Nucleic acid binder design. Structure first.
Ligand SMILES: [Mg+2]
Lengths: 1321, 195, 49, 390
RNA sequence: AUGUCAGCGUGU
DNA sequence: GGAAGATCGAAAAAAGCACACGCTGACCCGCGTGGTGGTG
DNA sequence: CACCACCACGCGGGCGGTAGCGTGCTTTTTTCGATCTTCC
């Protein structure tokens, strides 16, 4: 295989053994694709704005005289670019326009005749747009809308496994969850009575909902029971007996038929008698008259001659009632087939409990339940019941809801109406009754097949629909106002509700979270996050235990290890690498179809529900390269459980070994050698590492660094191939190839790299080029390296020389001993950028101004400020220094923004936003001039290319016609326009080319004018503010004791001591180690991945050192080729093949220069390098095979009594710095209500002496210290002052006084009708 | 069967680890206690225990699904060796169960501590002796096979309520109001005193 | 920080703490059900004196 | 009073929410409207509704959301009434009375310090300088180095060397209360003597971690300064770590070597079979230590050394006994730190965790408290040093 | 010189 | 032989849900009427 | 001098609607109608 241009610079050695059948998909697709479905023009109204408009429109007036219908919608181009929105603070959004037709019908003839039609296009607000990285720009800040894992609409049957009633009986219940409407619940009472609840209200007998559906008792009994016919003979009273009905029965009477004693009295009917009766096929069996009385009559029976109800429906029979029925002439009677275990009489008992007797009574009772106090009227009850479940505007069982509803009831069809019906509720109650009987099983609520994923598109569509129904109500209000002959749809509708709803969803939602930009991995993980919280979902406090656990269906869809550790554990998950979403929202995972034993390559995306039936083999199943499993007993999983299986019983195969982990969890090398808890900690800590000032590639990786780096929008990726025309530290210009050229284009790609811009975590985002002049590039090749990225690979930490040994207790529990060189070489030094805003508003007395003069200050403090009142860029500022000199009218009061105490750095950026109308200061003019100059430079480059082409054409035509090439060369190029030719077609061609030149110049002048207008347009702000000035401060944080460091295997710690270089342990060659770690952590925290990573990194660094030594000797390219080829060929049936024969000399040299600091090794997350391969790679270099060398003591020099484990390990500097954690306070400002010291570090505040600390002090004899902390240190203001003056005077005594908080509480209770006081007596 | 196999593997590993070190004496050779770093760390009590070492070198043993039932096929791979995808997914169940338990335990424990503190925050030793002759019985607690706590632990550092008699002699072994320190506990246990 | 104010109520109003906190002190003192007290308080039923 | 329901300026022309003010305004509106209705002799069909809704407003002010629906605020949410700001976890009782925020306190991450003694903790220079500011001002004014409090503040800000000398003088025997955020039991806060260190992290003794349940893991801890004579005496006599050696829960000791001390002492107290210098005879532990440090005999060599051990008699004094004991070089070296009263049977074995704990318990029971503290410090030092050397 | 809501995270 | 005391089961309502710290955003009436004011 | 624009403002309240809004916790106390039982 051939490699890309960026990959050929430094090829990562791969130890993967199994070939890759399916490449890793785009990581952010689940964020982009869904939003596409929100905004794509769909011919069928199934998703997005088209579906919402079809659902709402058309809109009819109150009177059937006019209406407003919708034709088409169009999303206009965004006014501002993503970069412009980010730098200005506006929201990245696009206008939405809709074609609306107002139809005014004929007043005299309302049968459908129309009178007037008015078509128009109306603008109804701005919809925020998703960028190319699947993130939103709201109010100039990056926001991510995480997906929500929520229970899917449908019917769910569950129960409590004896948790209630103290009797152990299970109370089965069924819930009909709609996408929009009221919830219907059918529960079973302890006394086996079916009750119905609506929206968790009071329960009512289940027959009420049937009676409200125009059902009589006879119909209900027919629906819910099997009818036994008791035909009256002369004296036999034979029943219509079914042999199956004799199963599980007790024969209290002798069963005799066909003149044979089939069952004797007092003998239970065993299976033998049931089978013998089935063989007999006897229908009529004589019954005694006493057996009838125990049954319930199926239907009402009437004595027609007398016209009186001899027996009604559904009451217990009796001997006198039976005699009356017999003498009434009713020969044929019907009763219910009821069994104590098979067909329980729940419906009959519920009907007996039910007090209603007619449809109107049931409707009245339902209305009384729903609306207490209001008088139950026929019309009101009818309207309420009709709108509850059988109206489209109130009840909406979505398409997925209908699909789940039909599937749960075993219905062949998967399509239907979005509203309920009699049949659906009847079937739900029948299924619940069957489940109570024993047939069927309850549904697993936590099953991933019962949990849908709602992405950004679905939530945005729902909010848009809410806004749209509000707008449609507002427009129905105005549609019946008459005088429509002079009204346009533009002023007919109001866009306020839609815009308000969409803004509130995109700015202040539960799931529209702030994007964390610590590193590319952080953003990638945040975008691919599924949160069970949010509206219509779980709560953090009431989540429970059973919902946080790892269900077996999580395999290949949800990462089992990557989850936050804390209150919300198991409620937040990360999508797997290969996982994707169905059209219904259910997660699905890829699989390789296995046919006739041989594994094929066709990929099928199996869902959670359907994958249960199939038998799925593991990824790590050995194959003989012919698709046949090497061994017969393959370990597979059938239904959420693992077992052995035959080689011919497999149905599907795992597509990869990374299918089960997420992107963040797949970046941990040797993950299979780590405990799950430690892997979880490592994965969580990986996305917290700040990027250093020099990205260092991981010497040991997993091969997924390229995908993570490219997919995240942190690096500049060439759109089209070509050659790099111009390289600079800030911008890149690529001359595209002729194949990818577009007609009428100069054909250059311009990339403006973002340099030193703050992220959401106050870190530094920086892009650095990785290409040189003349270097050919292709589409998809990296041109610049973003933060924590090196040549297209994710680089979060640094490769440090580590040694595992105890060192004088300076790494006692988890501490880390760091050599002085680590600080000296700035290996972990990071850059942090802080933003400070000064807002020049307008006050009642007058408008404040940002000026260069402030009262009662000296010239030295004002030296940094210029005449414009804003500090000089690049000036070194410290705590308390004035940044934006501002005076507000009281003559004026100084309110200038100042650097917070304890904050220093250098001003690197100043952005000034001015409201339109207010004059712009000199600094704003300078910034606008710089932006205009950059835009003019870009447009001038394009114009130069195009005009060079046009002038070449002109010169070619002239030399073809006038052959004045030498004269034209002597003449200035511009004067070629003045020079002409003889009267022929050459003159016409010259005139046409001159006209084209003039029109091109005019067009580019128009482009420059447009860019200048966009730059100088001005920014709209909130009311009351006339200017905003934002200043950025850059600080270089260097590593120091107390800083938190960590590896990728959960091994975290705090730097304990910066040891001198000479004190560190050193080997025979005299090279000291960089990091000393305690071995004691490994045996307890079972993360063996760090040891294997150390050994592999040592081998890689040995290979790199050998390459560097060979390079230093100026050896011929043949030796380097041979050595690098030998290094790459090492392995045991590795899939990666590198051929250096076709690399040519020069590239090889470059590759060698990239490998002189250690050849990278890629270790797949579950197919990594074994111990034998590690030993082979170590032996390839001049290093011990065991991986342990003999060290010397730095201080004393004696050999350590045992060989120690040294190597190279990837270290990460987490975003927990000691300078951000240390705080102290002796005396500062206090709260104005409770007179207590403030809280926090940003404001000078003291630590909280909590209740537990008070308890601990009480456990001691500590009474004076406690009282001193309670009153004289915090609350007693007179005590505070007297104590301060006494300590200054040197007397260590206190006057406790009375805490002010108690006085506040006393006045607080006194503010009620309660008197409380302290008595001196 | 799988539990017995895991026990056998752990025993064989510990036998091969604790004393495999064979060293030559001034004459012939002999077997001495091993100097292995893992075994030195485990035996000295510094870090780890038998279970963690047996997970590092022997098979990880049986694992249980979140409902608590045992899975038929155990994790037959050590942490030094490689765990396939299925074994890692199996172990994640118990890992997540433990993590969720320890995440949700803190609030309940804190609430219980708050209630306990508030129910007994007014009790202070404010006298020396009431003269009460009423006390409580203390006997070793035994429930069908094991002595959960010896009498010495239960009665250590406590004041006798009455004259404790020597068993079967009706002679005072300790006085009426003597605090049972270590020597008194030794005297009590040397005479086989039960209550 | 210390001085309090007062508002002279034009019509008497029940103190919610004594009326609502179960068991109701008003109801227990007058031996009347909480429903009757809460319905005569919010002007929906007359009560004899 | 208004000061207990303040109106907070918002530096933008508007003010804060002021929930109590809103409820009071609602009640005042209802009262004024009812007065206006009454003075106009309004019929009993209108004043009845106004009286009922005035009662509802009073209900909302006293206890919002108690009976019906809470008065929705400007944020579409229930409002906070008078009762809501007394009860609950955020009420005045549990947020400003039982516990509060205190001055003379700070917070920072922790870091292991091996050189520290059991009664000492390492305090960063900046935190120590800021926390003890009033003491520094008093000492500066006492010695005449500054003329006024403003001069002392300027000297402290300028970071003069005399300020550092004064700070070193003031914390000589001023204990500081070190506390951890989860204070499960009594030992969660303990008094330590401050040692000024150059850095940004608090240096904690390795032995006191077990009581604190703390790991050098990024965990933070808080520092409080007792600033009365009584408070200092209480910290020294009750809260000091030397006093806290037995757990109040069950009487078990809380100071036990855990990770590296046990490993080091286990490596020292272990015997090989053919180590260098095996079978040699040494005059005393000093000769064994010299031989080991000279690279002549291995730490595991089995030798015979003449040692003298002191035993306590009935009278309470110490009687010596000198004899030749067969032991190892490491055990003989370790014997140099064991106090006089202890026998030799404690160290003549492979010292694990339980062995070290039993040795410390015997030292406490036989000798007392100060010898036990010094012995624990020496044990930790030797364990760390020889674990590093191993 | 606030408060509150929501989210994320750290240490237990 | 029916009213009152006892039971009782279900429905409702209230009260609670660790500590400490760091950071971010987002917000902090209304609204429709009446009075007032410049104006061509 | 109407005439359109602009600001106090005031009392008003659940909000917006030609109605509902709510739906994944556990324990304790009340209470209130239905049953019973039982007893004078
Ligand atoms: Mg920790």
């Amino acid at each position: 295989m051939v490699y890309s241009y960026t990959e050929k610079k430094r090829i990562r050695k791969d130890f993967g053994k199994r070939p890759q059948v399916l490449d890793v998909p785009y990581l952010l697709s689940i964020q982009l694709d869904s939003f596409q479905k929100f905004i794509e023009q769909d011919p069928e109204g199934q998703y997005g704005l088209e579906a919402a408009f079809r659902s709402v429109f058309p809109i009819q007036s109150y009177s059937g005289n006019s209406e407003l219908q919708y034709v088409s919608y169009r999303l206009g181009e965004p006014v501002f670019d993503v970069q412009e929105c980010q730098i200005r603070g506006v929201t990245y959004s696009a206008p939405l326009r809709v074609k609306l037709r107002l139809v005014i019908y004929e007043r005299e003839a309302p049968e459908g005749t129309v009178k007037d039609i008015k078509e128009q296009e109306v603008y109804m607000g701005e919809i925020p747009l998703m960028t190319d990285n699947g993130t939103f720009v709201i109010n100039g800040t990056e926001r991510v809308i995480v997906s929500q894992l929520h229970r899917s609409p449908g019917v769910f049957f569950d129960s409590d496994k004896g948790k209630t009633h103290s009797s152990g009986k299970v109370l089965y219940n069924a819930r009909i969850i709609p996408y929009r409407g009221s919830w219907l619940d059918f529960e079973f009472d302890p006394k086996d009575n079916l009750f119905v609840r609506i929206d968790r209200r009071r329960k009512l007998p289940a027959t009420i909902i049937l009676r409200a559906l125009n059902y009589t008792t006879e119909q209900i009994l027919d629906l819910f029971f099997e009818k036994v016919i008791f035909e009256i003979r002369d004296n036999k009273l034979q029943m219509e007996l079914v042999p199956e009905r004799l199963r599980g029965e007790t024969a209290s009477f002798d069963i005799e038929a066909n003149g044979k004693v089939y069952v004797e009295k007092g003998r239970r009917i065993t299976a033998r008698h049931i089978r013998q009766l089935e063989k007999d096929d006897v229908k009529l069996i004589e019954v005694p008259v006493e057996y009838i009385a125990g049954k319930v009559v199926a239907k009402d029976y009437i004595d027609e001659s007398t016209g009186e109800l001899i027996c009604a429906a559904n009451m217990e029979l009796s001997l006198d009632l039976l005699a009356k029925l017999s003498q009434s002439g009713h020969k044929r009677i019907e009763t219910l087939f009821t069994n104590d275990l098979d067909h329980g009489p729940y419906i009959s008992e519920t009907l007996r409990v039910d007090p209603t007797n007619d449809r109107l009574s049931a409707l009245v009772e339902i209305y009384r339940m729903m609306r207490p106090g209001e008088p139950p009227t026929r019309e009101a009850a009818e309207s309420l019941f009709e709108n509850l479940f059988f109206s489209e505007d109130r009840y909406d069982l979505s398409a997925v809801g209908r699909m789940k509803f039909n599937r749960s009831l075993l219905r062949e069809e998967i399509e239907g109406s979005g509203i309920l019906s009699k049949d659906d509720i009847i079937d739900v109650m029948k299924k619940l009754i069957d489940i109570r009987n024993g047939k069927g099983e309850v549904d697993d609520i936590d099953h991933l097949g019962n949990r849908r994923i709602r992405s950004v598109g679905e939530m945005a569509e729902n909010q848009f629909r809410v806004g749209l129904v509000r707008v449609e109500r507002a427009v129905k209000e105005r549609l019946s106002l008459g005088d429509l002959d002079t009204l346009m749809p533009q002023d007919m509708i109001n866009a306020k509700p839609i815009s308000a709803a969409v803004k509130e969803f995109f700015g202040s939602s539960q799931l529209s979270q702030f994007m964390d930009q610590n590193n590319p991995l952080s953003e990638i993980t945040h975008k691919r996050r599924i949160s069970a919280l949010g509206p219509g979902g779980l709560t953090r406090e009431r989540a429970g235990f059973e919902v946080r656990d790892v269900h077996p269906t999580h395999y290949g869809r949800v990462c089992p290890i990557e989850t936050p550790e804390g209150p919300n554990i198991g409620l937040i998950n990360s999508l797997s690498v290969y996982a994707q979403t169905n059209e219904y929202g259910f997660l699905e995972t890829p699989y390789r179809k296995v046919t006739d034993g041989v594994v094929t390559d066709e990929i099928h995306y199996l869902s959670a529900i359907e994958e249960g039936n199939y038998v799925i083999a593991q990824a790590n199943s050995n194959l003989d390269e012919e698709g046949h499993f090497v061994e017969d007993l393959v370990t597979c999983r059938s239904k959420g459980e693992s077992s052995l299986f035959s080689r011919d019983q497999v149905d599907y195969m795992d597509v990869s070994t990374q299918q089960v982990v997420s992107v963040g969890a797949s970046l941990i090398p040797f993950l299979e050698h780590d405990d799950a808890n430690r892997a979880l900690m490592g994965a969580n800590m990986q996305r917290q590492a700040v990027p250093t000032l020099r990205a260092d590639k991981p010497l040991v990786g997993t091969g997924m660094e390229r995908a993570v780096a490219v997919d995240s929008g942190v690096t500049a990726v060439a759109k089209r191939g070509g050659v790099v025309q111009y390289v600079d530290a800030s911008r890149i210009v690529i001359k595209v190839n002729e194949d990818e050229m577009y007609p009428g284009e100069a054909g250059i790609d311009i990339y403006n790299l973002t340099k030193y811009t703050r992220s959401n975590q106050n870190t530094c985002i920086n892009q650095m080029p990785c290409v040189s002049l003349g270097e050919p590039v292709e589409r998809g090749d990296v041109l610049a390296d973003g933060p924590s990225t090196d040549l297209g690979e994710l680089a979060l930490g640094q490769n440090m020389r580590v040694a595992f040994m105890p060192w004088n207790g300076y790494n006692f529990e988890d501490s880390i001993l760091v050599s002085e060189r680590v600080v000296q070489e700035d290996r972990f030094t990071t850059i942090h950028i802080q933003e400070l805003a000064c807002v020049s508003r307008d006050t009642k007395l007058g408008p404040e101004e940002i000026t260069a003069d402030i009262p009662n200050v000296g010239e030295a403090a004002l030296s940094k400020l210029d005449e414009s009142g804003i500090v000089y860029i690049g000036a070194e500022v410290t705590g308390g220094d004035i940044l934006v000199g501002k005076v507000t009218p009281k003559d004026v009061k100084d309110s200038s923004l100042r650097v917070p105490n304890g904050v220093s750095g250098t001003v690197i950026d100043v952005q000034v936003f001015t409201r339109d109308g207010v004059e712009k200061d000199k600094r704003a003019l300078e910034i606008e001039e710089m932006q205009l100059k950059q835009a003019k430079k870009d447009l001038s480059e394009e114009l130069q290319i195009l005009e060079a082409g046009l002038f070449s054409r002109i010169r070619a035509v002239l030399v073809a016609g006038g052959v004045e090439a030498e004269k034209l060369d002597k003449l200035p190029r511009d004067r070629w326009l003045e020079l002409g030719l003889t009267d022929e077609e050459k003159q016409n061609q010259l005139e046409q080319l001159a006209e084209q030149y003039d029109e091109l110049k005019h067009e580019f002048e128009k482009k420059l004018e447009a860019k200048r207008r966009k730059i100088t347009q001005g920014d709209d702000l909130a009311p009351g503010v006339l200017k905003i000035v934002k200043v950025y401060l850059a600080v270089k944080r260097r590593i120091q004791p107390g800083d938190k460091m960590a590896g990728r295997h959960g091994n975290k710690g705090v730097i304990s001591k910066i040891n001198p270089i000479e004190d560190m342990p050193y080997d025979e060659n005299g090279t000291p180690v960089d990091i000393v770690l305690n071995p004691l952590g490994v045996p307890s925290r079972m993360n063996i991945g760090q040891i294997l990573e150390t050994h592999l990194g040592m081998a890689a660094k040995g290979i790199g050192d050998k390459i560097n030594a060979m390079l230093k000797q100026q050896q011929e390219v043949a030796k380097l080729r041979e050595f690098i080829q030998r290094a790459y060929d090492l392995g045991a049936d590795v899939r990666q093949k590198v051929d250096l024969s076709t690399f040519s000399d020069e590239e090889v040299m470059r590759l060698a220069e990239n490998l002189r600091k250690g050849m990278p090794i890629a270790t797949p997350v579950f197919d990594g390098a074994k111990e034998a391969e590690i030993k082979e790679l170590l032996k390839l270099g001049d290093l011990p095979t065991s991986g342990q060398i003999r060290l010397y003591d730095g201080r004393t020099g004696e050999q350590f009594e045992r060989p120690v484990t040294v190597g190279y390990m990837y270290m990460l500097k987490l975003n927990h710095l000691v300078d951000d954690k240390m705080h102290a306070r002796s005396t500062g400002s206090y709260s104005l209500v409770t007179q207590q010291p403030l809280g926090g570090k940003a404001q000078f505040g003291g630590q909280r002496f909590g209740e537990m600390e008070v308890w601990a002090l009480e456990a001691y004899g500590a009474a004076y210290t406690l009282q001193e902390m309670l009153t004289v240190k915090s609350d007693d203001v007179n005590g505070r002052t007297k104590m301060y003056k006494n300590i200054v005077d040197g007397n260590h005594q206190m006057e406790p006084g009375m805490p002010e908080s108690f006085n506040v509480l006393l006045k607080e209770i006194r503010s009620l009708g309660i008197n409380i006081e302290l008595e001196d007596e | 069967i799988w539990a017995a196999a895991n026990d056998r593997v752990s025993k064989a590993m510990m036998d091969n680890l604790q004393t495999e070190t064979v060293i030559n004496r001034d004459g012939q050779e002999e077997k001495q206690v091993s100097f292995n770093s893992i075994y030195m760390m485990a035996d000295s009590g510094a870090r780890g225990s038998a279970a963690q070492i047996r997970q590092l070198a022997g098979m990880r043993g049986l694992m249980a699904k979140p409902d608590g039932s045992i899975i038929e096929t155990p994790i037959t791979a050590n942490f030094r060796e490689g765990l396939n995808v299925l074994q890692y997914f199996i172990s994640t169940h118990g890992a997540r169960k433990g993590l969720a338990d320890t995440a949700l335990k803190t609030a309940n424990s804190g609430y219980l501590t708050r209630r306990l503190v508030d129910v007994a925050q007014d009790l202070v030793v404010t006298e020396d002796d009431c003269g009460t002759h009423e006390g409580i019985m203390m006997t070793p607690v035994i429930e069908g096979g094991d002595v959960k706590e010896p009498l010495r632990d239960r009665v250590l550092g406590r004041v006798t309520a009455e004259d404790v008699l020597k068993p079967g002699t009706a002679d005072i072994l300790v006085p009426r109001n003597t605090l049972l320190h270590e020597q008194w506990c030794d005297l009590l246990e040397e005479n086989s005193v039960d209550a | 920080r210390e001085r309090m104010g007062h508002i002279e109520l034009a019509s008497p109003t029940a103190h919610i703490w004594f009326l609502k906190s179960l068991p109701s002190r008003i109801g227990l003192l007058l031996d009347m059900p909480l429903r009757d007290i809460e319905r005569v308080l919010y002007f929906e039923s007359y009560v004899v004196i | 009073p208004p000061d207990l329901r303040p109106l907070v300026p918002l530096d933008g022309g508007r003010f804060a929410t002021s929930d109590l003010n809103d409820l009071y305004r609602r009640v005042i509106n209802r009262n004024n409207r009812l007065k206006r209705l009454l003075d106009l002799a309004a019929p009993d069909i209108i004043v009845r509704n106004e009286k009922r809704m005035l009662q509802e407003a009073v209900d909302a002010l006293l206890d919002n959301g108690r009976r019906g629906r809470a008065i929705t605020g400007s944020n579409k949410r229930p409002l906070k009434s008078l009762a809501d700001m007394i009860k609950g976890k955020q009420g005045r009782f549990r947020q400003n009375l039982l516990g509060k925020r205190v001055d003379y306190s700070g917070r920072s991450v922790i870091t292991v310090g091996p050189y520290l003694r059991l009664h000492q903790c390492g305090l960063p220079k900046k935190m120590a300088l800021e926390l003890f500011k009033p003491f520094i001002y008093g000492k500066l004014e006492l010695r005449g180095l500054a003329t006024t409090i403003k001069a002392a503040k300027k000297m402290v800000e300028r970071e003069e060397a005399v300020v550092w000398d004064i700070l070193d003088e003031v914390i000589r025997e001023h204990p500081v209360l070190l506390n951890r955020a989860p204070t499960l039991h009594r030992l969660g806060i303990q008094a330590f003597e401050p040692v000024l260190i150059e850095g940004k992290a608090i240096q904690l003794h390795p032995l006191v971690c077990a009581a604190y349940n703390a790991d050098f893991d990024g965990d933070q801890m808080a520092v409080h300064v007792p600033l009365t004579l009584e408070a200092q005496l209480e910290a020294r006599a009750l809260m000091m770590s030397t006093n806290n050696i037995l757990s109040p829960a069950n009487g078990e000791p809380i100071i036990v070597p855990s990770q590296d001390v046990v490993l080091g002492l286990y490596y020292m107290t272990r015997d090989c079979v053919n180590a260098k210098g095996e079978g040699m005879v040494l005059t005393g532990p000093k000769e064994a230590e010299r031989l080991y440090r000279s690279g002549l005999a291995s730490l595991h060599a089995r030798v015979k050394v003449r040692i003298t051990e002191y035993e306590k008699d009935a009278n309470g004094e110490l009687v010596a006994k000198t004899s030749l004991k067969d032991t190892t070089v490491g055990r003989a070296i370790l014997w140099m730190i064991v106090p006089k009263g202890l026998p030799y049977s404690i160290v003549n074995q492979a010292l694990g965790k339980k062995a070290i704990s039993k040795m410390l318990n015997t030292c406490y029971r036989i000798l007392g408290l100060k010898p036990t503290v010094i012995f624990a410090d020496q044990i930790m030092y030797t364990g760390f040093a020889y674990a590093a050397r191993s």
